[model samples]
Target: APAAVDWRARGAVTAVKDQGQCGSCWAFSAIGNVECQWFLAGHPLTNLSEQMLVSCDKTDSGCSGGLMNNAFEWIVQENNGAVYTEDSYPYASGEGISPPCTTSGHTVGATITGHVELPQDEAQIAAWLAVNGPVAVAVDASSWMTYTGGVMTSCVSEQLDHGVLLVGYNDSAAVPYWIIKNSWTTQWGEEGYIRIAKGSNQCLVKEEASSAVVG
Candidate 1:
């Protein structure tokens, strides 16, 4: 396995997105993984709609809370593997309002045939990500509200409340860290990204790791 990997530099990741006041981190995590996987599959790095999942995915409660794995499953089994583009089904749950689910007049940007759940181990997840693409992960982001930048070494690792994306990792660094893609917009930490200490499994990052599969 490689010691360092970054999907953003390879053009497999998309720009930092904002989830607004809604608790739709799961949707962003799922869509972000799908976007990266689609790009890795030799397609354009398209911006899939998080709104589609937040609104239409009945398996998950929009804005309240959801799981990335559930979102992936809903995409493949319930949505006919069709993921719409941001231009067609733009995000509407900004002000903490989850409008009713809608399904029509949207253009398909990418489709996910299936998904994979990784083991509850950081090194194993890193290895898979180094070869495949990006992985969707759940974390206890309680302390992230005040974070600014730099690698996070000390973090609360109990309850996994927030869903984020595992973009890359630098094992050779002075403090080995895992790069995370958050949906709090570019104004947040490290331009909408967070780096948590690796190996130690900070912030429950290794607990619920997954990725969207493109076919």
Candidate 2:
């Protein structure tokens, strides 16, 4: 296996943001994937708007919860793949309430043609992330609420309750782990990141792996 891969250090991943108590993790996961793709496409790192999807997108429940697949489809089919910057459509529904969508300060940021889902295999997901960018994934975060550090191995449950970004992987460690970028702020996990045990599909990380394709 290769030594290691770090998208954040390489400038592909953007700074971690907080999703608060809302079930808007799906929006963050989708935004994270698109942001990395935008950067890899030679664009400067810009914060994409998650609130835009939360409040505007009709395919998924705004703050209650959502699916990464629905969010991706809505972005392409409804918004024409257009997303606004964080400053433009700043997050305002974090209190677990559905806020009215704001269009005043919206600014077009990244636009993707569509999204592709990866196979349910860790190696395939890792290889995809190696070449592409971060991937949007839905995983059972039942045990993530108390995760602090170390190789995460106990959060592998069937109830996939949260969405997170699979940023990179580290095969050089004793136990290979997939580097995960979360949206619960930098204060949670390892500065808004976590390393889940690889090869075993921990928390079903490979089940819903996907990435937005730049047009």
Candidate 3:
């Protein structure tokens, strides 16, 4: 049988919003990936606290913005295989939280397989989603607060925003679309998410697209 995603049957996927001036992008990516994994495994949409990963996952460098690969590494190396829940950990400004706040007395997460990448072709993308849980792709994503969604063309000159989850994609229609989970508020662009042109690695994940997958 043909399908866009076999994981959606697992349940509705959710995301977290990290406003501007917040260098917690790495935290959002880590938590979002884990959250998606939980949902795929038949758990309710759990708002896993990014604060725990941000404050405790030191090897990943939060204030300066870290990489998803490093975050997964710290989870395995330091915390001794522990993934924090929203209740156990909490969200903070990330700027004010010092090392002793969460790291001093908390367990970290299990070993993640670094970051996976995906292919550039549309069919390859659909195949990627079918096999893996979800993918994290980078986008230029400039001025998302003012985005009025329809179709995002002419993004050639905009500066890159950061990385985001590429949950799903389709090419059945005249124009293909990439379903993404964004950190902007729901009131922003099409309920806190926007779709841009596919096939262009302008976001820089093309080199190793399979590495973008959470699993």
Candidate 4:
């Protein structure tokens, strides 16, 4: 461990987002990784469209549920290697109801060549983030519904219920936790963030982690 690191402090992380009552955390997770990867690749931060994936990705259910890997695959294969800007597609649905798919007036903002799946190891995940950018991770999130922030440790089950972003880490801290970005808005945790205990596979954070590769 190299003391500490924060992608947000390095201008990699975008603003916190709210998925509303939608079970589309996978969309936000995939989009978050793409945003950070594009920024780290010397491009201006682009607000990629989660609505595009939610509506047209096909592989994953719009508001019901989805997986980050499926979202990435849809971006690479079905979406024609491009994603639209958020303002172009915006978010059409609210209150967990997925609206009809819309393709008009949308502009392709960013294109990702592919995605790399990280190993199920904490050190590897941390090293990858330190070198590349933020990664999409799935965790239990069973206890995050009532989190207010400090260092989240209440969620003991790691069955992987929700998808989130593993942005950074601080192995030298008193508790030593992984900094995570959530799609639950700023009023939830530490400004739409959470810190799960590191190295112990807390919340199954490293069970399935991945990062997009933008060219």
Model 1: ten consecutive residues of lowest lDDT: 1-10
Give the least accurate 10-residue stretch of model 4, judged by summed lDDT: 151-160
lDDT for model 1: 0.91
lDDT of 1 by residue, 89-202 (tens): 999999997898778999999988999899999889988999998999999999999999999889987798999989999989999999999999899999888998999889
TM-score of every model versus the real structure: 0.98, 0.96, 0.77, 0.96
- Which of the predicted structures, 1 or 2, would earn the higher lDDT when compared with the native? 1
Query: How high is the lDDT of residue 41 in model 2?
Result: 92
Identify the candidate with maximal lDDT.
1
Clashes of 1: 0
TM-score leader = 1
Question: Which sections of candidate 1 miss by over 4 Å?
Answer: none
> Which sequence of candidate numbers ranks them by TM-score, best first?
1, 4, 2, 3
Tens-place lDDT digits, model 3, residues 1-215: 12445343556466447534567666676667777765655556666666766677767655557666666666666765456766566666544443444544433332244455455565676676766576655556554545688645445435544667666655553465566677655777777767655445434433323332223
Better of 1 and 3 by lDDT: 1
lDDT of 2 by residue, 1-215 (tens): 25678888888888889888788999999999999999999999899999999999899998888998899999999887798998888888767886887666689988989999999998888887888878899999888889988898656568788898988899988998999998888898888889988888789788888889986
Better TM-score candidate (2, 3): 2
* Superposed model 4: Cα runs more than 4 Å off: none
